[PDB]
Ligand SMILES: *C1=CC(=O)N(COCN2C(=O)C=C(*)C2=O)C1=O
Ligand SMILES: [Cu+2]
Ligand SMILES: [Cu+2]
């Protein structure tokens with residue numbers, strides 16, 4: 001099975017998918033993030049961040065408070081399983097993580113931590 | 129009947145109401161907008177803008193392109209019936225407009241034009 005997914009974050013503050021399925025036969029999984037919009041990072045920046053459903057709110061809250069210079073993520077946040085950098089218009093970034101970090105049955109969420117975006121930019125990730 | 133309404137825009141990118149009813153006996157109507165959040169205008173700014181439902185998308189699109197220095201509103205936009213200034217954390221602004229500018233039966237929408245906010249920060253305004 002394939003072990004990567006291409007995701008886009010646009011100016012309408014949205015991801016082009018709300019669900020990701022990671023096949024258990026994958027050893028590593030790659031997420032390619034691109035920003036096909038025209039707005040800069042400081043105004044419409046997006047990142048793809050993965051945590052358990054329970055940790056999401058905490059990550060989003062501390063991230064918001066951390067500021068743009070920290071890509072809106074609290075430094076040394078052990079709750080973040082994987083994440084891309086915060087990108088703006090015309091940029092792209094990829095993150096590859098070990099699937100062994102995921103456990104079956106557990107609920108995972110991916111989201112953007114730029115202030116307010118997680119309201120719409122979020123989705124589930126499942127290991128099947 | 130009362131002819132004013134207090135509205136708040138917060139850091140969670142949301143208005144504390146999604147519907148406004150203007151009593152036809154009102155000659156003027158006032159909207160008091162406040163921002164009880166902690167984020168600055170450049171990152172989480174909010175304004176209250178009124179237009180017909182049909183004009184909303186156009187106002188939001190041209191506003192986004194106009195930039196922060198223009199309060200995210202195209203200059204001389206005749207589609208905007210009324211609007212407050214774009215405000216940030218701890219700020220407040222009020223707008224009073226003549227109810228005669230509204231017609232019964234017509235569909236009106238109020239929204240924030242800061243990039244991406246209209247996705248969640250919008251509501252209906254009706255003259256009853
Ligand atoms: C994109 C990055 C950046 O710093 N910037 C300018 O931001 C100016 N302001 C402001 O006026 C209030 C907060 C803030 O960052 C960009 O446009
Ligand atoms: Cu985002
Ligand atoms: Cu807003």
Ligand code: NI
Nearest residue numbers: 001002003025
């Ligand atoms: Ni395979």
Ligand code: NI
Nearest residue numbers: 129130131153
């Ligand atoms: Ni009255």
